Design a protein around this ligand. Sequence first.
Ligand SMILES: C[C@H](CS)C(=O)N1CCC[C@@H]1C(=O)O
Ligand SMILES: [Zn+2]
Ligand SMILES: [Zn+2]
Length: 266
Amino acid sequence: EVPLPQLRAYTVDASWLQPMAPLQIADHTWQIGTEDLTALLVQTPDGAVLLDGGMPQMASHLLDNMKARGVTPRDLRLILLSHAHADHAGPVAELKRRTGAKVAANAESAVLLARGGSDDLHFGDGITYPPANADRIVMDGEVITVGGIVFTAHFMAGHTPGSTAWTWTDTRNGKPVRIAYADSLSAPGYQLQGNPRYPHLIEDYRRSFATVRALPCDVLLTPHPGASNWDYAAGARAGAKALTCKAYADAAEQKFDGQLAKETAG
Ligand SMILES: C[C@H](CS)C(=O)N1CCC[C@@H]1C(=O)O
Ligand SMILES: [Zn+2]
Ligand SMILES: [Zn+2]
């Protein structure tokens, strides 16, 4: 007799789980995640913001990096998300338990986060994580301000219904730097055409390419740094090769058009 298969854990490349020290992006903005997963800390005179947390098991690493920056659990006021997949929202529940952080997300991201990534439109229960509740629901173009840093939400539905780009203005060398944290624009294994769970998927992706192309974007960062040609392990030249938002969107659309043709052929 043959039993049912064992549950399969969501395993990833080692680099995605490789701790790194804080890497400064601009005067108030640091990468504090791993070599291959972004987790941005924005530190202000009136508290700190975390954009994404990476994988579930990264909670303690993030807190150690925060502490290295001078940010205590109480100082963390807000968590924002690119999208609510396990490799970006993974430790959110734990972070909420262990800090003062509240979560702000759009309705789509909130509902997916509340399900722990279960019943994903494309992955089903393949990639789940501890569920968390959002404290505040944000609308497209809504701004959230923490210690003078103004974060604007730009909905860019496709990778997930709730995919969001977050933009804000920091400084570097006395000059403004408009940072754009643009979400994933991939569709990994997705049925793109005539998908009953996402009937307007293709139109949403196309609108999202347009949104990304137009973002205020002196510096682009992405949840997977490789997608925007960042190399977090490259120290002083980590961001040297970074794509513009325009180039990121163009590359994403070209890949998408190729995937559509492959889907039609398959
Ligand atoms: C399982 C994750 C969720 S973002 C995934 O599908 N990835 C990670 C890197 C590449 C691939 C994709 O988004 O195309
Ligand atoms: Zn994802
Ligand atoms: Zn991912």
